Amino acid sequence: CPLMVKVLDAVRGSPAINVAMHVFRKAADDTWEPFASGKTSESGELHGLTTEEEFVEGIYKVEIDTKSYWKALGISPFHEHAEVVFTANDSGPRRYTIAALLSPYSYSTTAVVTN
Amino acid sequence: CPLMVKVLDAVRGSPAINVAMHVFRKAADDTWEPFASGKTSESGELHGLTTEEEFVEGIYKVEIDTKSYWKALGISPFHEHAEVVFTANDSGPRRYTIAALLSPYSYSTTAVVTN
Amino acid sequence: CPLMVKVLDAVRGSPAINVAMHVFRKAADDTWEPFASGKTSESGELHGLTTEEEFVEGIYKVEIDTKSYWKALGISPFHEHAEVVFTANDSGPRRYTIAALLSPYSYSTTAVVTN
Amino acid sequence: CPLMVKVLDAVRGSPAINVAMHVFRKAADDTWEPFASGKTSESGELHGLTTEEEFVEGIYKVEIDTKSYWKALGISPFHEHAEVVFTANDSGPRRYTIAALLSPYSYSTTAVVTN
Ligand SMILES: CC1(C)C=Cc2c(ccc3c2OC[C@@H](c2ccc(O)cc2O)C3)O1
Numbered sequence: 001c002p003l004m005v006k007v008l009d010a011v012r013g014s015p016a017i018n019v020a021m022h023v024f025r026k027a028a029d030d031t032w033e034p035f036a037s038g039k040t041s042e043s044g045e046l047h048g049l050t051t052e053e054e055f056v057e058g059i060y061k062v063e064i065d066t067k068s069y070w071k072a073l074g075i076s077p078f079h080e081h082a083e084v085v086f087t088a089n090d091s092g093p094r095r096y097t098i099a100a101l102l103s104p105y106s107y108s109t110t111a112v113v114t115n
Numbered sequence: 116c117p118l119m120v121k122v123l124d125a126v127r128g129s130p131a132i133n134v135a136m137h138v139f140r141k142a143a144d145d146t147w148e149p150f151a152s153g154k155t156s157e158s159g160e161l162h163g164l165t166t167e168e169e170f171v172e173g174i175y176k177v178e179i180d181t182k183s184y185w186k187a188l189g190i191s192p193f194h195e196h197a198e199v200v201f202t203a204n205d206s207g208p209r210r211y212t213i214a215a216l217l218s219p220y221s222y223s224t225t226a227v228v229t230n
Numbered sequence: 231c232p233l234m235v236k237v238l239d240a241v242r243g244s245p246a247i248n249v250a251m252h253v254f255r256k257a258a259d260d261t262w263e264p265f266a267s268g269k270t271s272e273s274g275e276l277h278g279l280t281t282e283e284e285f286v287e288g289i290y291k292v293e294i295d296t297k298s299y300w301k302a303l304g305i306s307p308f309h310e311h312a313e314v315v316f317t318a319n320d321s322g323p324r325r326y327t328i329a330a331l332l333s334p335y336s337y338s339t340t341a342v343v344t345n
Numbered sequence: 346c347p348l349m350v351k352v353l354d355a356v357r358g359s360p361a362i363n364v365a366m367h368v369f370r371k372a373a374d375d376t377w378e379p380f381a382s383g384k385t386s387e388s389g390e391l392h393g394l395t396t397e398e399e400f401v402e403g404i405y406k407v408e409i410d411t412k413s414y415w416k417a418l419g420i421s422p423f424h425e426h427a428e429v430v431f432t433a434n435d436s437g438p439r440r441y442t443i444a445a446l447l448s449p450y451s452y453s454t455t456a457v458v459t460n
């Protein structure tokens with residue numbers, strides 16, 4: 001698939017399991033339209049969000065529900081969520097892997113983009 | 116100073132200078148209301164965004180224009196911008212330092228919350 | 231395998247390919263003994279460093295040659311290398327995944343430990 | 346102050362206080378020579394490690410006792426310690442800020458190198 005997200009937990013040293021996230025695409029009228037959504041598996045991965053045909057050129061936002069994740073573990077975290085906003089497929093189709101590391105008061109994200 | 120942002124550059128090993136950001140507060144209708152804004156100084160710091168009187172409880176969004184930063188350095192960035200979204204003062208007013216570290220395909224942010 | 235390392239490049243948004251690393255184990259005399267070594271593949275992964283039988287309880291050090299990596303790309307980085315030092319298998323055999331993200335002046339590492 | 350270290354805690358959203366570290370300089374025989382040491386203050390900072398006269402070109406290692414830090418908080422950590430190894434002053438004397446962010450299974454460090 002052309003878009004997948006993997007989430008790790010820096011407190012437990014484990015994948016971050018059952019983490020919900022919503023993907024949006026920027027529309028012509030500059031609003032965010034719902035594009036896809038899912039949650040991470042027991043390996044902390046979310047696959048199959050979209051397809052090569054559906055995943056057209058555009059600006060995308062992945063909003064990761066880190067707050068509910070920490071809350072379910074008894075932690076009151078700093079962030080409401082973690083976002084990743086990027087232009088995709090500008091120079092042709094690419095595959096995107098979004099990696100996120102979660103702590104109660106911190107997060108890191110990086111992107112691996114391949115042809 | 117109840118809210119301070121500090122931005123570092125992971126490619127050049129320096130403060131990230133002249134980085135523009137806007138701070139929003141979530142309104143009752145769930146849209147983002149402009150609240151404050153500024154550019155990081157030569158030390159990568161942005162101060163005096165708000166005061167303790169004005170900085171009431173609510174959900175705040177700091178949107179950092181990382182894309183313009185990398186473009187000025189002649190480097191192609193992944194993200195459109197970096198966001199930090201958080202609930203402020205849920206236990207009564209505190210002081211917030213938001214630290215962000217920027218790379219072209221990655222960013223890390225952490226909060227320091229003091230009394 | 232019980233120990234694998236994956237390395238990403240935060241400047242290129244890609245795996246960090248052909249990154250050399252050496253693993254050492256702490257000996258009885260408190261010296262570092264060579265344990266295994268390898269380099270990352272085109273997916274930025276290094277597998278097959280060791281086996282369940284060989285990978286006994288101990289303190290291990292993974293020393294990642296980040297300097298040569300950046301140098302080969304024309305960058306003079308801050309760090310000589312990135313280390314990860316940890317006690318392994320203290321409560322019984324585990325599988326360790328070491329993830330590292332590289333920038334010229336920064337690095338991040340996290341560990342995923344599973345049974 | 347030519348060398349300063351600042352440590353943050355990603356679980357508690359605070360400076361990491363009373364974190365002990367030692368700084369070493371590589372000797373001609375490739376062993377690590379004690380050079381300086383201290384504990385982070387209430388602001389997570391450690392200053393006055395060295396002076397511009399004494400801080401000559403060489404390879405320096407800052408070894409941060411992250412393990413003792415987490416143990417005192419009652420939290421099981423992955424790493425034995427965190428290291429930062431770097432060549433200093435290769436273009437003539439500069440000022441170094443080493444920033445480290447600590448989680449139980451992860452750490453991030455970045456350098457700010459100023460003139
Ligand atoms: C989160 C990460 C990866 C590691 C620590 C870090 C950072 C970006 C910015 C800053 C960080 O910690 C130090 C902090 C800081 C710098 C100067 C200062 O005077 C006070 C501070 O609290 C700024 O990236």
Ligand SMILES: CC1(C)C=Cc2c(ccc3c2OC[C@@H](c2ccc(O)cc2O)C3)O1
Binds near residue numbers: 329
């Ligand atoms: C620590 C930080 C900042 C955030 C997560 C991260 C990383 C560097 C490398 C990897 C990271 O998480 C995903 C991980 C990974 C990638 C592919 C895969 O198949 C399995 C994995 O565990 C690799 O940097």
